[PDB]
Amino acid sequence: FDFSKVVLLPFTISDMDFATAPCIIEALNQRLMHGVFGYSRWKNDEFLAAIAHWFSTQHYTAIDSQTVVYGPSVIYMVSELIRQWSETGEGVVIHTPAYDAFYKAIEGNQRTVMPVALEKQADGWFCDMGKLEAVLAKPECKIMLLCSPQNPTGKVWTCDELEIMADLCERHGVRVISDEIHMDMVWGEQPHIPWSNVARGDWALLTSGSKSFNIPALTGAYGIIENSSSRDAYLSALKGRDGLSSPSVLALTAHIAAYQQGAPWLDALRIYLKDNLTYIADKMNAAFPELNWQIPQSTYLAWLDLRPLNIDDNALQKALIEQEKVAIMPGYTYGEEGRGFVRLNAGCPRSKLEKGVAGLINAIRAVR
Amino acid sequence: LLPFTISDMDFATAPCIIEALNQRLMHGVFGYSRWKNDEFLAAIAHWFSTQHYTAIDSQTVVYGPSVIYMVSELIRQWSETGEGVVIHTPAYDAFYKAIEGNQRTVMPVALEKQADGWFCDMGKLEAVLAKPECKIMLLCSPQNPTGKVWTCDELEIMADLCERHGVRVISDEIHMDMVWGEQPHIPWSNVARGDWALLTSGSKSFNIPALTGAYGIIENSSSRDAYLSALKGRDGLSSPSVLALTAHIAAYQQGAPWLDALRIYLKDNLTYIADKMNAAFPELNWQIPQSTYLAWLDLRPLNIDDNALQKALIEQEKVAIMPGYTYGEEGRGFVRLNAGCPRSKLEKGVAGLINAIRAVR
Ligand SMILES: *Cc1c(COP(=O)(O)O)cnc(C)c1O
Numbered sequence: 001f002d003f004s005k006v007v008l009l010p011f012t013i014s015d016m017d018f019a020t021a022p023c024i025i026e027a028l029n030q031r032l033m034h035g036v037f038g039y040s041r042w043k044n045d046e047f048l049a050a051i052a053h054w055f056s057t058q059h060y061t062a063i064d065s066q067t068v069v070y071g072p073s074v075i076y077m078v079s080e081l082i083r084q085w086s087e088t089g090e091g092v093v094i095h096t097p098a099y100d101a102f103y104k105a106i107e108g109n110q111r112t113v114m115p116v117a118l119e120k121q122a123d124g125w126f127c128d129m130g131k132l133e134a135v136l137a138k139p140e141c142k143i144m145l146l147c148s149p150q151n152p153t154g155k156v157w158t159c160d161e162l163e164i165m166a167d168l169c170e171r172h173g174v175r176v177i178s179d180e181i182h183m184d185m186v187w188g189e190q191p192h193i194p195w196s197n198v199a200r201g202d203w204a205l206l207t208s209g210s211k212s213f214n215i216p217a218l219t220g221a222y223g224i225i226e227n228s229s230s231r232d233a234y235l236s237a238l239k240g241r242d243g244l245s246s247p248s249v250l251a252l253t254a255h256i257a258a259y260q261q262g263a264p265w266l267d268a269l270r271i272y273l274k275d276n277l278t279y280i281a282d283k284m285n286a287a288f289p290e291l292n293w294q295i296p297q298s299t300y301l302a303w304l305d306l307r308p309l310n311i312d313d314n315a316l317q318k319a320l321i322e323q324e325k326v327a328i329m330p331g332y333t334y335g336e337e338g339r340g341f342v343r344l345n346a347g348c349p350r351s352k353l354e355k356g357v358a359g360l361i362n363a364i365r366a367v368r
Numbered sequence: 369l370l371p372f373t374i375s376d377m378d379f380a381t382a383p384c385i386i387e388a389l390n391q392r393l394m395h396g397v398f399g400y401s402r403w404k405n406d407e408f409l410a411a412i413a414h415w416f417s418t419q420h421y422t423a424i425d426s427q428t429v430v431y432g433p434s435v436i437y438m439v440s441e442l443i444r445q446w447s448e449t450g451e452g453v454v455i456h457t458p459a460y461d462a463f464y465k466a467i468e469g470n471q472r473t474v475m476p477v478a479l480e481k482q483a484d485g486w487f488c489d490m491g492k493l494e495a496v497l498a499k500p501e502c503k504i505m506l507l508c509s510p511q512n513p514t515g516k517v518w519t520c521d522e523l524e525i526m527a528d529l530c531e532r533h534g535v536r537v538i539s540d541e542i543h544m545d546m547v548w549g550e551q552p553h554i555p556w557s558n559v560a561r562g563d564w565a566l567l568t569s570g571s572k573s574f575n576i577p578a579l580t581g582a583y584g585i586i587e588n589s590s591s592r593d594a595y596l597s598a599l600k601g602r603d604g605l606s607s608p609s610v611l612a613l614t615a616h617i618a619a620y621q622q623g624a625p626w627l628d629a630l631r632i633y634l635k636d637n638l639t640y641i642a643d644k645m646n647a648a649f650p651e652l653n654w655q656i657p658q659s660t661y662l663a664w665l666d667l668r669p670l671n672i673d674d675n676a677l678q679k680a681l682i683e684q685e686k687v688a689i690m691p692g693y694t695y696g697e698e699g700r701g702f703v704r705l706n707a708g709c710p711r712s713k714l715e716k717g718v719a720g721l722i723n724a725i726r727a728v729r
């Protein structure tokens with residue numbers, strides 16, 4: 001496995017520049033040679049068995065295959081559950097800075113987003129639980145959309161924070177939707193704990209292998225929706241109301257191959273990515289000791305805090321574009337929380353990353 | 369049991385589609401892709417011009433995960449909870465789901481079988497369209513399961529009645545490519561006015577539903593944009609399966625030769641059914657449908673019992689043929705037989721239908 005091969009220089013989007021695992025390609029090619037593409041069921045045993053297998057070997061978490069469901073995308077499932085677990089006008093809690101699509105999904109459903117900003121300190125990001133509860137205790141707060149691992153901070157929640165939150169939500173009648181699409185990209189010592197381990201009552205855990213193996217263009221996602229009534233409601237909306245029960249057979253095939261044979265490839269990728277993130281830390285801290293930037297606990301996205309440099313976000317952006325011809329997502333796209341940050345996608349060959357960092361460093365100096 | 373019960377075919381898709389998917393496959397990368405792809409749009413324009421003699425504006429085309437998803441959203445968009453959606457019955461099962469799933473009311477206008485094919489009584493339709501609460505007309509064109517291919521006349525009258533009574537039209541034309549008669553299929557865009565939608569896909573024509581994807585024309589900047597922000601913003605479905613796009617491009621650009629060979633094979637299959645059934649039961653002058661590879665067989669002239677017949681087919685012939693009563697009253701006395709399969713299979717199908725009809729006359 002070699003990721004040291006290249007298949008405005010851009011570092012702005014959610015996906016990677018790598019080709020997927022060869023075992024996935026070989027599996028798609030085989031399914032391809034069968035020629036027939038008639039209607040297929042997602043309630044496929046192999047698919048479900050592959051999921052169960054992945055959770056217990058990669059996450060040491062036991063799940064019931066019967067509670068799993070299919071979805072066209074993770075956001076579609078978040079959107080439907082929101083329509084299902086709340087009334088127009090009620091609130092959905094999310095930690096900010098947040099993944100852009102959450103706002104769309106929440107406000108698109110004429111629901112109100114209730115933000116709880118995360119705090120950066122000593123080592124890592126933290127959620128003030130008193131603040132979160134102050135918001136959850138609100139009568140109109142009905143759902144908590146939890147990004148775990150958290151994008152873009154890369155925070156990997158600890159067993160304690162998950163317990164506390166699971167507890168506060170049960171206490172105030174707030175259902176939890178856990179978006180864990182980044183579950184496989186963990187770098188630290190503390191492992192990712194699937195929400196199912198602390199889950200109570202009505203909850204959902206939503207994921208896919210699209211971010212891990214870079215196959216979003218195949219569509220498909222899956223999740224665990226608990227309380228069989230919540231699950232059936234979701235399904236009759238998926239199949240009956242919206243006519244989306246028929247899955248792309250290739251998305252299923254890719255996941256089966258990914259979860260059954262993709263471990264070796266995923267492990268090589270994790271190492272390559274972690275070193276890439278490390279490279280950024282070394283280059284940035286050497287040039288700007290004040291930064292004291294640590295690599296994230298998870299994710300191949302670098303949420304770089306530049307506030308210590310007292311640089312101007314727009315000036316910097318101008319220099320990157322016109323002078324360095326590099327495209328790096330300016331943190332202010334996430335509202336105030338991201339003022340003074342830049343997000344750099346490290347999911348790419350290092351030769352490419354080198355130019356992006358060199359670019360950032362030049363730009364920063366050009367405007368100090 | 370030998371099955372003849374589902375919407376798709378038993379054939380492998382066109383080889384040009386496979387070869388195109390394999391090629392896209394070898395590129396290895398499957399990152400985010402845009403559907404606002406010129407080739408895709410160009411392929412669609414090309415298909416409509418050279419197969420339906422209809423000119424369309426590529427700028428009005430949009431992508432959808434499935435046709436029903438598009439019908440569902442437009443319904444949420446062009447009506448209020450509780451209002452009515454008109455459909456001709458017998459209708460495709462999913463229409464009820466889509467309408468009632470959105471807590472909307474379905475207003476049926478039964479089609480009438482007579483002399484030669486099926487017809488819609490326009491006075492009856494208008495009686496329903498004039499209703500204050502009727503806001504949309506879901507038009508299946510060609511119509512499933514009757515196979516009716518509406519005439520350039522009927523599309524004028526209905527387009528007219530709908531404009532007159534403020535009723536928006538959604539035209540589901542997913543069967544557009546499977547036309548057998550002399551009268552060709554007329555895309556709704558040719559008589560369209562104001563706010564309307566034409567929804568299709570190549571999934572039924574090339575048998576690639578397992579690839580997902582569909583596309584359509586939504587008219588009036590407003591409705592189109594509203595649909596798009598719901599697709600991308602609210603439901604997070606704007607990212608398409610790159611393979612569905614690839615399949616369509618290859619289908620519309622090189623699939624003609626394959627589609628033509630299929631049309632002929634299917635038409636003869638339908639014909640085979642007519643010959644075998646009419647020879648055994650002259651007490652029914654069944655004509656092959658104007659479109660579709662589905663046989664909507666009227667057995668009422670035999671005064672047979674739907675359930676008894678069904679019992680004989682299952683236990684005695686071990687053949688599975690969709691009983692028409694699944695479509696409510698309109699389908700009482702009918703059976704739908706999918707002719708989209710190898711004839712060797714069809715033979716053992718029509719055969720089992722006979723040993724069943726006779727077993728219970
Ligand atoms: C990439 C990503 C998703 C994926 O959404 P799709 O609709 O399945 O592309 C969801 N959540 C987060 C937090 C992501 O970063």
Ligand SMILES: *Cc1c(COP(=O)(O)O)cnc(C)c1O
Pocket residue numbers: 243246375433434435436437460508512540542569571572577582
């Ligand atoms: C098969 C069929 C469809 C296709 O629906 P999908 O949701 O795209 O599978 C739509 N309409 C009719 C009338 C059909 O027969």
